[PDB]
Every structure is written in structure tokens, then in C-alpha cells.
Design a protein around this ligand. Structure first.
Ligand SMILES: NCCc1c[nH]c2ccc(O)cc12
Length: 373
């Protein structure tokens, strides 16, 4: 049925982010950090144009064979080249599983109201993956061994792939009934660009904040190392709550208004992080940041599907490749550019710049109220 497709997409995204987050504490123990995101950004539009040619089931199932190969390559690798190869393979997989899975969800839940909350649930998949990533990784790392986390995650990826092969049955290539509108015509749409830009700036704010916040906490607050890991918890829990609630709330409120308010709340929250003196001062603003990132993503993915349905041809592979490029731009240029700006003009000014950009971008979501057909 359809809820099994929703579960498959949720599980793919959850395992993808659990891997992405169990890898990050092991790596130091620069290019490797941005490698997955940039390779996924490169191979997003290709998958977008491919799902319209072979269908959704096959490029979503290749996303389990690529993520499984990446996972096992992480567990039995020592060299730096092999870790880079493993992270690039994870990037290609994730591209396959995010783009093809969101396309499948939008193709199956073909109703504007239902698509909202199923996108919300699939997105909360990423929050549940990031949130349960580090603890699982650590406990399985030290209580069993250093190859343990990745081999157990590989077993989980295999079980998810078994569910995939039993639900989707990717045996045969099935092209779409109608040829989807080209990628350039989509990219010339002022509304698809506004949606992608709102997702891009929200996630770039959060992706520049995550790595820059610990480097500032150890300098201003003299925080211990456990504090650095705990100070970012409100973001993930709040993103989980925000996505799961606003998938259902945004269509009653209006997706344009939910996106506008999410942008303004991300802006204000990020403008209000540098004013915190102690760790208890980074609970409320980080909560606002994560809550509003969810408020924006759970409102702007269904709108992507809707904007394609209303104006262009009903093929969702490319437009969700565009949405996933907007996602990945932030996580690719986040660490590097954020560290560069913080190393040059400081962390408070970086946060003020990001907040100003988000607040000034917010009024552009007004143009999503009633776009013409
Ligand atoms: N839009 C998903 C981003 C998101 C939610 N919570 C997070 C915590 C850290 C991070 O880099 C990113 C996130």
C-alpha cells in the first residue's frame, strides 16, 4: 500500500542520517566533511531526470545497495582515500534515496492535504536519524568495538533493503506515463525558486550554526565537552516536533504563511544566539531555530509538489531533485564558509548576518499565497 512506501522513505532517510552522524565523531579520531554533500548535490539532478526514465522503484532501491556498500566500506577502512570514497558513495546513495523517495511519496500521495503530512513524517525521519545517531554510535563503538557501529548499521540497512525489495519490487524498469518538464524550465520559475531558496537559507543557517557553535562555546562559555554535545539537542528534538506537527498544520494555516513565519523565527532565533552567556541561554534560541527549520521544510516540500502539479506537468522527480539541491547546498558550504566567516569577523557577526538574511528573505514567501496556473 502507500503507508509502506512512507515507511520505506522514512527508514531510508533515518538510516542515511544515522550513518552521516555516526561517521562524524570517528573522522577526526576538511574536504571529507563536505564530500558527501557535494557529491549528492552533483548527482541530484541526474537522479531527478532518471526517475522519469526508469521509474521511482529502481533509483530508490539502488540507494540501498549504494548505502550498504558505503556502510561496509566505512567499517573496514584505514586510509583517507578510502574514507573519502565511502563518504562519496554515501552521497550518491543519499541522493538516490532522498530524491527518488520524495518523488515516490509525492506521486503516491497525490492529494495536497495528505502529501503535506506524509512529507512531514518523512522529514521527521531526518530528525529522528540525527537525534539517535550519536548515542547509538558511541555506545556500540566503545561497548563492543570500532567496527561495531557500522556493521550494525549495515545490518539495519540490509533489513531496510529487504523491506524495500518486498514492497517496491524493483525488478522491472517502468518509465513515467508522461515526460516531465525539463529541469531548466523548472529553474526559471519564480515560485519554485522561492521555495528552493527558503529551504536553502533555512538549512544553510542551521548548517553553518552546528559546527560554529562549539568553536564559540569553548571560547566564551568555557564549556566542557559533554556540554558541546548537549547544547545542540534542542535543535534536533525541535525539528522532529516541528516537522511532525506542521506537516498537518501548514495546510490548515496556509503553506505560504507557515513558511513566512518559519523564516522569521529562524531569523530571530539565530539573531538571539550570540546574546547568550551560559549553556542555559542556548536552549530557547536553539529550540526556536530547529522548530522553525521544521516549520519551513514541512511547508515548502509539499509546496514544491503542488507548484509542479499546478503549473508544470505532474512529474515530481526533478522538482524534488531541486529541493534536495537546496538542502545539500547548505550542508556542503556550511562548515567551510561558516568557519571562514567566523575566523574573519567573528561568530556573533556570522549569526547576525544569517539572521538578517533569513528575516529579509521571509517577505518573499508572500508570493506563494496564490501563484497563477
Ligand atoms: N532541515 C534539517 C536540518 C536539521 C534539523 N536539526 C539539525 C541539527 C543539526 C543540523 O546540522 C541540521 C539539522
Amino acid at each position: 500500500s502507500r503507508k509502506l512506501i512512507l515507511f520505506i522513505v522514512f527508514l531510508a532517510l533515518l538510516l542515511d542520517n544515522m550513518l552521516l552522524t555516526v561517521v562524524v565523531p570517528i573522522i577526526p579520531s576538511g574536504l571529507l566533511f563536505a564530500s558527501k554533500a557535494t557529491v549528492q548535490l552533483i548527482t541530484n539532478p541526474f537522479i531527478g531526470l532518471l526517475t522519469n526514465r526508469i521509474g521511482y522503484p529502481i533509483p530508490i532501491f539502488a540507494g540501498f545497495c549504494i548505502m550498504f556498500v558505503s556502510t561496509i566500506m566505512f567499517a573496514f577502512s584505514s586510509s583517507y582515500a578510502f574514507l573519502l570514497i565511502a563518504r562519496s558513495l554515501q552521497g550518491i546513495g543519499s541522493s538516490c534515496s532522498s530524491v527518488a523517495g520524495m518523488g515516490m511519496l509525492a506521486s503516491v500521495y497525490t492529494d495536497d492535504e495528505e502529501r503535506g503530512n506524509v512529507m512531514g513524517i518523512a522529514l521527521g525521519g531526518l530528525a529522528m536519524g540525527v537525534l539517535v545517531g550519536p548515542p547509538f554510535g558511541s555506545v556500540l563503538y566503545e561497548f563492543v568495538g570500532k567496527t561495531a557501529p557500522f556493521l550494525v548499521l549495515a545490518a539495519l540497512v540490509l533489513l531496510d533493503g529487504a523491506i524495500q525489495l518486498f514492497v517496491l519490487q524493483p525488478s522491472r524498469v517502468q518509465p513515467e506515463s508522461q515526460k516531465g518538464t525539463p529541469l531548466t524550465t523548472l529553474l526559471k520559475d519564480p515560485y519554485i525558486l522561492i521555495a528552493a531558496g527558503s529551504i536553502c537559507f533555512a538549512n544553510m543557517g542551521i548548517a553553518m550554526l552546528e559546527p560554529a557553535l562549539p568553536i564559540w562555546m569553548m571560547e566564551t562559555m568555557c564549556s566542557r565537552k559533554w556540554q558541546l554535545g548537549v547544547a545542540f539537542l534542542p535543535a534536533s528534538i525541535s525539528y522532529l516536533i516541528g516537522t511532525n506537527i506542521f506537516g498537518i498544520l501548514a495546510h490548515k494555516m496556509g503553506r505560504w504563511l507557515c513558511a513566512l513565519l518559519g523564516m522569521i523565527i529562524v531569523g530571530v532565533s539565530i539573531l538571539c544566539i550570540p546574546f547568550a552567556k551560559n549553556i542555559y541561554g542556548l536552549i530557547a534560541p536553539n529550540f526556536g531555530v530547529g522548530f522553525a527549520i521544521g516549520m519551513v521544510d514541512s511547508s515548502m516540500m509539499p509546496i514544491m509538489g503542488y507548484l509542479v502539479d499546478l503549473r508544470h506537468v505532474s512529474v515530481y522527480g526533478s522538482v524534488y531533485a531541486i529541493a534536495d539541491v537546496a538542502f545539500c547546498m547548505g550542508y556542503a558550504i556550511g562548515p567551510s564558509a561558516g568557519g571562514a566567516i567566523a575566523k574573519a569577523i567573528g561568530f556573533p557577526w556570522l549569526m547576525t548576518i544569517i539572521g538578517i538574511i533569513d528575516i529579509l528573505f521571509a517577505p518573499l514567501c508572500f508570493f506563494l499565497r496564490s501563484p497563477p496556473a
